[PDB]
Amino acid sequence: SAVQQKLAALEKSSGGRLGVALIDTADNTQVLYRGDERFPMCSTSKVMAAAAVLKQSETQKQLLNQPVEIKPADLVNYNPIAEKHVNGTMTLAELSAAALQYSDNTAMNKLIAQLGGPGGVTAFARAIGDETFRLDRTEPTLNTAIPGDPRDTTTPRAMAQTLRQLTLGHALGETQRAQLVTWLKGNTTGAASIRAGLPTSWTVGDKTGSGDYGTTNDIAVIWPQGRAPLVLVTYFTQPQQNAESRRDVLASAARIIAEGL
Numbered sequence: 001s002a003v004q005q006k007l008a009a010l011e012k013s014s015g016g017r018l019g020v021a022l023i024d025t026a027d028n029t030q031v032l033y034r035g036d037e038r039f040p041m042c043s044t045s046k047v048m049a050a051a052a053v054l055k056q057s058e059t060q061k062q063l064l065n066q067p068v069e070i071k072p073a074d075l076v077n078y079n080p081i082a083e084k085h086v087n088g089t090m091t092l093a094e095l096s097a098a099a100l101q102y103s104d105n106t107a108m109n110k111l112i113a114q115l116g117g118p119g120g121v122t123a124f125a126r127a128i129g130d131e132t133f134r135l136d137r138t139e140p141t142l143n144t145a146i147p148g149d150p151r152d153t154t155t156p157r158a159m160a161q162t163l164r165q166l167t168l169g170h171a172l173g174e175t176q177r178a179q180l181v182t183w184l185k186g187n188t189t190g191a192a193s194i195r196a197g198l199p200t201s202w203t204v205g206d207k208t209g210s211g212d213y214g215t216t217n218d219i220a221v222i223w224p225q226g227r228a229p230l231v232l233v234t235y236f237t238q239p240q241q242n243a244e245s246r247r248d249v250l251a252s253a254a255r256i257i258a259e260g261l
């Protein structure tokens with residue numbers, strides 16, 4: 001279609017590999033570009049860790065208020081929020097918020113630990129019907145984004161369907177779902193990514209990811225004013241290990257998608 005021609009052209013102009021999946025919940029139509037190719041998730045995986053903990057809280061009703069100690073040894077490479085609570089505690093709710101809204105890597109590692117390891121995060125994905133997601137490592141090594149390495153990858157199509165189920169569907173309880181949406185809507189790291197390609201009147205909840213090989217990702221739920229919501233996943237990775245982030249590519253893909261509606 002027109003939109004696939006333009007996404008192909010954008011990809012060609014960028015020098016990298018672009019993966020896009022859009023789900024329009026109005027008619028359950030999908031637009032896919034490299035939709036079944038694997039991409040490194042980087043920090044977009046944090047949505048799955050947070051949702052898994054939310055699912056646990058449906059039975060352990062007080063789980064999110066459980067304090068978790070932040071020790072110096074827990075600190076890894078990017079801990080904007082956990083750093084503020086070293087030698088203190090954060091609740092599982094505060095860690096989930098920090099992982100999602102600030103992409104805090106220490107928070108993510110605490111969520112993985114709560115789930116019994118990366119296998120516990122992957123297990124939740126399987127439980128909600130995502131056969132494609134795989135989490136293999138903890139922070140920060142899950143961001144190595146090595147070409148062809150299947151570790152810590154998913155496909156755009158799979159992530160779009162799963163994000164739809166978590167935020168708009170009923171993979172989570174009503175309170176848990178609302179909490180996840182609130183967290184995503186309050187993301188602080190997404191201004192230059194999908195959000196930048198869309199009308200300012202639209203409400204967006206998203207989770208960015210960045211990693212080696214110039215990997216630049218964003219997954220978003222989008223609420224246009226007076227219109228059915230959309231789920232948009234944009235994955236981008238590059239051939240040079242030290243390539244710079246290209247958030248502009250995600251903005252541009254979002255703009256191209258938005259134009260076609």
Ligand SMILES: *[B@@]1([O])O[C][C]([C][O])O1
Nearest residue numbers: 042043078103209210
């Ligand atoms: B994710 O990708 O977002 C930021 C951090 C950097 O390691 O991980």
